[PDB]
Amino acid sequence: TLRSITSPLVAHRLKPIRQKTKKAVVSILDSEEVCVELVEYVKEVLQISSDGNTITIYYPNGGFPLADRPPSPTDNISRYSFDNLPEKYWRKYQYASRFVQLVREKEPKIEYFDRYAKCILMENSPGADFEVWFYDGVKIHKTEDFIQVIEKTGKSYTLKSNSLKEEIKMYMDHANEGHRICLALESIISEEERKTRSAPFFPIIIG
Amino acid sequence: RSITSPLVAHRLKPIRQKTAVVSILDSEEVCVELVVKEVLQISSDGNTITIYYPNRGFPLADRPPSPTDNISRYSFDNLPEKYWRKYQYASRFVQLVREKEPKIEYFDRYAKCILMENSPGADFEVWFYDGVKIHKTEDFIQVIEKTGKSYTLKSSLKEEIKMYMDHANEGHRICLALESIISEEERKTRSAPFFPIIIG
């Protein structure tokens, strides 16, 4: 069971992207499906559901040239659950998940303009990244692992654990309020998309 | 006061229109330059009017003349009648901006919904992805079919279009519920404003 190792990917609300590695192309489609074309001709396509829990695999007949769109499916097709997926495709599923993990860290879920900064909560929940692009060129990025400060000069620092330099704290004190605010809205609005179950309320731009 | 209510320019993006010149400043203050020779600056909340004269003077710049010492402040109530029709010009203008100024853009699978800033009872435009368009108002609803066949109903079932009108009504209910939820939170937080908002 792939489960014993990794976890199902999440691509919900991800804008489209196509990147060519050497071994193959990876995509996020308008459907928020994830496509891995193994490879210059495509010999194998994996199409993972936006949830992670479904993997569709189709081949050609013959020895599928490269393209904008991925190749429309064939009758040589299969479907697996995350649990049923054969070992053979596991490292492919993990390429797709690493990639998607990359995108979500940089995919805004909420953009909020305070008097003093642009605040960005990312899609890499739980514990998503949080960027604060101060309008006077200060930058504070918060991560589960750590916090990066960049000063108006370019002095850039990490704090995996505080006294900063006091003046840093005015900015960090703000960053924190912004995080508390974007985390309260995300909860409120998320509550609403539960109660209504209509169309996604994310991402949002505020102010 | 007896007549017009104080204007509201909260969250309105800047604009200078020439006719007198009227402006909404980056401060959400409303400026009327009469022609210059007189400047009225109404507060974003409508209740304070600052009036200053040149020391004519003031050639028509693209920005309002910086402040002078021939200056007055009034309350909405204190405002002398000499200035009432100037205030009312400013109020009509702002009513016009607000009706076309969006507070909420929501992207449904079928359409773009826009609740405007002309509360209470704000306009609600539904720009369907297929080219259908519905515009709700307190007075009436305009329907534009894909053809162009406009139809300003004022009170009715015409069939088929009811599929779209039902969607439009859902979107309104959804946008009117988000406004309430995010409005509660803004009441409880004291942070920077939460509107406008784009969702989707």
Numbering used by the authors:
A (entry chain A): 586 to 624, 631 to 654, 657 to 754, 759 to 804
B (entry chain B): 588 to 606, 609 to 624, 633 to 652, 655 to 754, 760 to 804
From the paper:
Centriole duplication begins by assembling a procentriole in the late G1/early S phase, and timely activation of Polo-like kinase 4 (Plk4) appears to be central for inducing centriole biogenesis. Plk4 dimerizes through the cryptic polo box (CPB; residues 581–808)6,8,9 of its C-terminal domain (CTD; residues 581–970) and its N-terminal kinase domain (KD)-dependent trans-autophosphorylation activity generates a phosphodegron at S285 and S289 to induce SCF-βTrCP/Slimb-mediated ubiquitination and its own proteasomal degradation. Here we demonstrate that Plk4 promotes its own ring-to-dot localization conversion by autophosphorylating and transmuting the physicochemical properties of its noncatalytic CPB, thereby causing it to rapidly coalesce into a nanoscale spherical condensate with a distinct constituent phase. Thus, we propose that Plk4 is an unparalleled kinase that harnesses its KD-dependent autophosphorylation activity to trigger its CPB-dependent physicochemical condensation.
A serendipitously generated CPB CP_v1 mutant containing a C-terminal random 32-mer extension also interacted with ANS in a similar fashion. To gain insight into how the CP mutations alter the physicochemical properties of CPB, we determined the crystal structures of both CPB CP and CPB CP_v1. While extensive efforts to obtain a high-resolution CPB CP structure yielded only a 3.7 Å overall resolution, the structure of CPB CP_v1 was solved at 2.64 Å. No densities for the C-terminal 32-mer extension of CPB CP_v1 were detected. An individual alignment of PB1 or PB2 of the CPB CP_v1 structure with the respective domain of CPB CP showed a Cα root-mean-square deviation value equal to 0.6970 or 0.7679 Å, respectively, well within the acceptable range of two superimposable structure models. Remarkably, CPB CP_v1 exhibited a substantially reduced level of twisting (119°), thus forming a greatly flattened PB2–PB2 axis. Since twisting of the β-sheet occurs as a cumulative outcome of an inherent property of the peptide backbone in each strand, the CP mutations near the PB2 base might have generated a long-distance effect along the PB2–PB2 axis, yielding largely disordered PB2-tip residues (see below). D707 seemed to stiffen the CPB architecture by engaging in two interlocking interactions—a salt bridge with intra-subunit H771 and the other H-bonding with inter-subunit A796—thus securing the PB2 β7–β8 of one subunit to the CPB α2 backbone of the other subunit.
